[PDB]
Amino acid sequence: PCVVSVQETEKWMEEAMRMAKEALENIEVPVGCLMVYNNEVVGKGRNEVNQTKNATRHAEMVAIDQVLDWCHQHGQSPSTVFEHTVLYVTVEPCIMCAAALRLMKIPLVVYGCQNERFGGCGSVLNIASADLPNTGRPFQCIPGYRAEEAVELLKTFYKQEN
Amino acid sequence: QWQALPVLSEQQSGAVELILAYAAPVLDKRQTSRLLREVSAVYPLPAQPHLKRVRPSRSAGGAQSSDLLLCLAGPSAGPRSLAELLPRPAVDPRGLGTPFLVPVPARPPLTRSQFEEARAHWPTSFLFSTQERAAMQTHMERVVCAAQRAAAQGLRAVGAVVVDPASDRVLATGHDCSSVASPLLHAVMVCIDLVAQGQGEDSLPYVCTGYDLYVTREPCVMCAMALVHARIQRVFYGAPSPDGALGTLFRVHARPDLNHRFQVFRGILEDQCRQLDPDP
Ligand SMILES: [Br-]
Ligand SMILES: [Br-]
Ligand SMILES: [Zn+2]
Ligand SMILES: [Zn+2]
């Protein structure tokens, strides 16, 4: 029920892209993401840091909260849902978010462009596959999907901030 | 009984490097005040203000004597005379002995084992005072009390508090709250949520800028990185955690490639905290 999500990577990531554009427009770091369980989207999040005024409200953490709400409202054990969920995000999870996905025991992230300032799947630290026996399970990464498009939006955003 | 240890980056954890300087013995104790004035006006040592300029030494009987820190040594640090080192009339070298080279600490000491190696060579400036130590204790008995409350309830025994050092006003106390529905409510994430909802309409999302965090035990990777994102200024914790990211497995508070760094002190009320829960 895990690789079954991967078939529409094109569609799922095109949809993450449309949210990165939204975040960009609303003065947020252009990062969007979806969480797919059993070919259904159980959670979407764009970066909400400046809107909520909460530094921790990264795209991935807005999506995790949304899945957990979906699990609560439908009476499903988050363990069995997260463990067969794939995350599609336009930018390599930061160090914080990578630890989050680990602790949620998410198995697979598909991501776009390198996160050079905060990346946690190899760029700055490798939280994603590190040996952390008390911080969840390591996950695997399919990097690179539509990276040239995604990195441009980062580069746009930072040319725009102080 | 406890003591605060700084967690610094590996680069800054090593031995303080040394540089060569010229010092000379003060053979006339009563010229000391005068000679210190005239010398450090010529050689103010603007880049080594942590060095004391007068080094005392107790003889085997308590008889005290002193050398004076003349100046830094040049590219070729040969033997040098008083006449060559101190210009006149700007300095009256009466009362001084023949100069000698001495290694001195290049940079001020940070850790207390670095104050040790450094005071060995030459006296330096510098951990916490009584008033502050007691105050930091109060905030850490508060996290401990909170961690115990979570343990009795059935949650992870981790306590956190966020404090504003300008007024010493506690801004948010909370413990671990992870549940099956909400597994990421670690103590640190709960305090950042509590500060966030309490702040005003005109606030930058760096919810923690300026503030201190005391937590029973060292944060996990997720918490630590969030502290960097939230721009905490100082973090105090008691015992380490096996997977901890402010000193044990990572030191994210002191990287160059993150747009924020902050001081971390470990070991505060560590005797009590050590029996509580590690994060995660
Ligand atoms: Br101390
Ligand atoms: Br590190
Ligand atoms: Zn992130
Ligand atoms: Zn944590």
Question: Which residues in chain A belong to E strands, given as ranges?
Answer: 32-37, 40-46, 85-91, 108-113, 140-142
Q: Report the side by side order of strands in the sheet with A85-91.
A: A40-46, A32-37, A85-91, A108-113, A140-142
User: Which residue's entry shows tokens 């040049």?
Assistant: B74
> Measured over all CA atoms, what is the biggest interatomic distance in chain A, rounded to whole angstroms?
45
Q: How far is the C-alpha of A158 from the C-alpha of B234, rounded, in Å?
A: 27
| A55 and B CB contact within 8 Å | yes
Q: Which amino acid is at B48?
A: Q
Q: How far is the C-alpha of B43 from the C-alpha of B53, rounded, in Å?
A: 11
Q: Which of A25, A60, A83, A148 is catalytic?
A: A60
Q: How far is the C-alpha of A48 from the C-alpha of B229, rounded, in Å?
A: 13
User: Is A15 known to be catalytic?
Assistant: no
Sort out which chain B residues have CB atoms less than 8 A from A55's CB and list them.
192, 205-208, 226, 229-231
| B246 and A CB contact within 8 Å | no
Sort out which chain B residues have CB atoms less than 8 A from A134's CB and list them.
220, 241-243, 278, 280
Other beta carbons within 10 angstroms of residue A35's beta carbon come to 28
Closest chain A residue to B229 measured between Cα atoms? A55
Helix (H) or strand (E) holding B115: helix B112-121
Spacing, Cα A95 to ligand 3 middle (Å):
7
Sort out which chain A residues have CB atoms less than 8 A from B172's CB and list them.
none
| B219 and A CB contact within 8 Å | no
Other beta carbons within 10 angstroms of residue B90's beta carbon come to 10
Short-list A53, A12, A49, A6, CA closest to A33: A12
Residue B164: how many CA atoms within 13 Å on its side-chain side? Answer: 9
Closest chain B residue to A75 measured between Cα atoms? B181
Judged by CB atoms closer than 8 Å, whether chains meet at B280 and A103 is answered as yes
Going by C-beta distance under 8 Å and a sequence separation of 6 or more, which residues neighbour residue A17? A32, A90, A146, A149, A150
Q: How far is the C-alpha of B216 from the C-alpha of B214, rounded, in Å?
A: 7
User: Which residue's entry shows tokens 């690179």?
Assistant: A144
Taking phi first (over 0 means left), then psi (-120 to 50 degrees means alpha), and beta for anything else, what does residue B223 get? alpha
Other beta carbons within 10 angstroms of residue B246's beta carbon come to 28
Going by C-beta distance under 8 Å and a sequence separation of 6 or more, which residues neighbour residue B43? B70, B71, B72
Nearest CB to B203; choose among A53, A71, A99 = A53
Structure tokens that stand for B90 in this block: 């700007």
The structure's method of determination equals X-ray
DSSP one-letter code for B30: G
Taking phi first (over 0 means left), then psi (-120 to 50 degrees means alpha), and beta for anything else, what does residue B203 get? beta
| A71 and B CB contact within 8 Å | yes
3-state secondary structure B170-183: EEEEEECCCCCCCC
